Each structure stands twice: as C-alpha cells, then as structure tokens.
C-alpha cells in the first residue's frame, strides 16, 4: 500500500482502537475490538495517553489480514500517521515509522476518526477495556 483508502473496505475486518494511560505512572493500555469478535489488551509501561493511541493502531496492523479498517478517536494518532502518508506522497519518532512500516506491506487500509464517548458501540467498547485499572473517572 502507498495511499489510505478513501472508504470502508468492503469485507474487511474493522479494528475500533484505542488508548488509556496513568499520568504520574506512565503506565498504560492498548487495545481494540473488532466487528468481527475478536479483542486484545496490552498493559504497557513508560507510556502516555498519546503513544498507547499509537501503539493500539500498531496492534490492529500487526493482527489484521493485509485488508483492513481502522477506526481511532484519536485526533493526534490520526493527524501524526496522516502527516506521513502526505509527506512522502521527533516525538514516539520510532513508533509512528514502525506504523509506517506495516502499513505498506499491507493491500488495503482504510483508517477512520470519529468522536470519542458518543455512543459509537466498537469504540465504547474498547474504551472500556483500556481505562479499566487505568482511568480513575
Ligand atoms: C464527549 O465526551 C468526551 C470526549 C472526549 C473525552 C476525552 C477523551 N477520552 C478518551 O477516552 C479518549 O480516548 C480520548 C482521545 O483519544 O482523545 N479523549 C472526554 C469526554 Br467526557
Ligand atoms: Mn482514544
Ligand atoms: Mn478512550
């Protein structure tokens, strides 16, 4: 893959993504849920609100097949990853490549932002999963 698909895959598993992580601890989780019933959490340490975002999106990519949807709520993920695809067209400067280089082995990727907390089922879900032991309220 060289560019983001425009739309959904049709027939593609959907990986909803996200992140939560402790502010004093660094400690965090990356996860996601998939329209297709599969789930994985990862606790990870020395990490923040912003890179366990990334890492989620790392975990989809690594367990997808080489077609696959993305939904994230994060705005930084998003944006960061984005800033890469346009450009070849400094901070968790390793982790955002290493995205990067799994996102061009694979045939398709569709990858998509909606709003946190709005009632979106796969993205509650996997909120749910990373903040639980992680996000006090
Ligand atoms: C509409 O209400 C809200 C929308 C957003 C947020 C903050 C938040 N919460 C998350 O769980 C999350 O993953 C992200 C993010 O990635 O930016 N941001 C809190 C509320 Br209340
Ligand atoms: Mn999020
Ligand atoms: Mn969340």
Redesign the pocket.
């Known amino acids: 893959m060289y560019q983001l698909e425009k739309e959904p895959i049709v027939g593609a598993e959907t990986f909803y993504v ?3 992580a402790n502010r004093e601890t660094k400690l965090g989780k990356a996860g996601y849920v998939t329209n297709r019933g599969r789930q994985k959490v990862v606790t990870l340490t020395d990490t923040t ?1 912003q890179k366990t ?1 990334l890492q989620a999106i790392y975990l989809a990519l690594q367990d997808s097949g080489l077609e696959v949807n993305i939904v994230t ?3 930084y993920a998003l944006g960061i990853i984005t800033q890469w695809i346009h450009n070849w067209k400094v901070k968790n400067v390793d982790l955002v490549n290493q995205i990067i280089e799994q996102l061009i082995k694979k045939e398709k990727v569709y990858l998509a932002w909606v ?4 009632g979106i089922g796969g993205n509650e879900q996997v ?1 749910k999963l990373v ?1 639980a032991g992680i996000r006090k309220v």
């Open positions: 996200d992140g939560a609100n975002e709520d994060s705005q709003p946190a907390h709005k909120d903040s």
